[PDB]
Homo-oligomer: A and B are copies of this chain.
Amino acid sequence: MKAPVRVAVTGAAGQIGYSLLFRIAAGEMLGKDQPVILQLLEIPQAMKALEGVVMELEDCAFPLLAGLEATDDPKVAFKDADYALLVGAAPRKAGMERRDLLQVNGKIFTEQGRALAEVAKKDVKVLVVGNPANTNALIAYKNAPGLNPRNFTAMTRLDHNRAKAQLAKKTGTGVDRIRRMTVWGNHSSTMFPDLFHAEVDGRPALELVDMEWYEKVFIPTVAQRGAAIIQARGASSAASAANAAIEHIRDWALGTPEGDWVSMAVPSQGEYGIPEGIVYSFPVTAKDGAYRVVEGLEINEFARKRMEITAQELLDEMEQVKALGLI
């Protein structure tokens, strides 16, 4: 049997957490042979609701759930954490400006970054889901002295999955036959879904679809997908976002399939010329807890242009954060 690992999840009583927790406890994230201890965190006002979630988790009689703890203290929630899913972020309110959102989020992730650095395992793997993901991750790792910045990542996996789904639908082929999809940059409207290196059942994607469709239909649709779901359901995409979070962690810890790669926003070390420091989505392979950016990919003018734009949007956000003295 495997020794239990501790998984910390913030914003645990929220929508994403409600879809997320039960699948983790069922062993879908780290394997059916891996027991887990869930350490849940919420703000004081949501502890009552979190209590209700804990009861539902007990009511599932999960054999792999070796422990369950709920708290409103980050130093308790992150204690000896092996994995940390930072889902909770600043709730957008009325009269609240862009800079106001940055300050409140700045406060949350500086505090959480520090707590992780103090009480979590030294090799703790972190995934930031709360928006703005890439920048909150920057704030966190920048305020986590002693921890490896590459252990801090942001989620672009949802966009990655949305792109594969759209391509599969268009080509009329199973999504399981789509490989080497890449989403570059920021988790925002400037994200760049790359079809230049994607393959559909062995054949290059651009041999089955044209540039007109790619530029005029594919890109806008993947970018608008979150909005389409809100317009349809009247609520955000919690379940698909939860699924993406699980796959992000799963592939990072268990490894990416042979001949394929996934999208992960990680602190840049200059790959493809992207400025160092910013959390940027890159194509990556993973093996036993460690990932590596896939280098050597040919970047044409169309791609570089879009890659530059989204990188610039991230540099701008960092400037604002620095201005507020958060990093």
**A176–B60 CA distance with the chains assembled, in angstroms:** 11
**A230–B229 CA distance with the chains assembled, in angstroms:** 27
Q: How many copies does the complex hold?
A: 2
Choose one: B49, B230, B240, B244; the contact of A232 (CB below 8 Å): B49
| B49 touching A234, Cβ below 8 Å | yes
* A19 close to chain B: CB less than 8 A: yes
| A22 touching B56, Cβ below 8 Å | no
Smallest CB separation, A75 vs chain B (Å): 25
| A61 touching B239, Cβ below 8 Å | no
From A157-165, A198-206, A290-298, the one touching the partner chain is A157-165
Find residues 24-72 in chain A having any chain B CB closer than 8 Å to their own CB.
26, 28, 48-49, 51-53, 55-63, 65
Smallest CB gap from A23: residue in B: B23
| B60 touching A232, Cβ below 8 Å | no
* A256 close to chain B: CB less than 8 A: no
* A18 close to chain B: CB less than 8 A: yes
* A143 close to chain B: CB less than 8 A: no
* A2 close to chain B: CB less than 8 A: no
Range class of the A interface residue count: 35 or more
| Chain B residues whose C-beta falls within 8 Å of the C-beta of A158 in the assembled complex | 59
* A92 close to chain B: CB less than 8 A: no
Choose one: B18, B65, B161, B235; the contact of A239 (CB below 8 Å): B18
| B52 touching A233, Cβ below 8 Å | yes
| B229 touching A56, Cβ below 8 Å | yes
**A28–B60 CA distance with the chains assembled, in angstroms:** 14
Find residues 210-239 in chain A having any chain B CB closer than 8 Å to their own CB.
225, 228-235, 237, 239
* A281 close to chain B: CB less than 8 A: no
Contact with B along A296-311 (1 / 0, CB 8 A): 0000000000000000
Not counting A19-B22, A26-B243, A59-B240, a sample of 13 additional A-B residue pairs whose C-beta atoms are within 8 angstroms of each other reads A13-B233, A21-B239, A22-B240, A49-B232, A49-B233, A52-B229, A53-B233, A56-B229, A56-B233, A58-B165, A60-B244, A61-B164, A63-B174
6 contacts between A and B (CB under 8 A): A22-B240, A22-B242, A52-B234, A57-B240, A60-B244, A63-B176
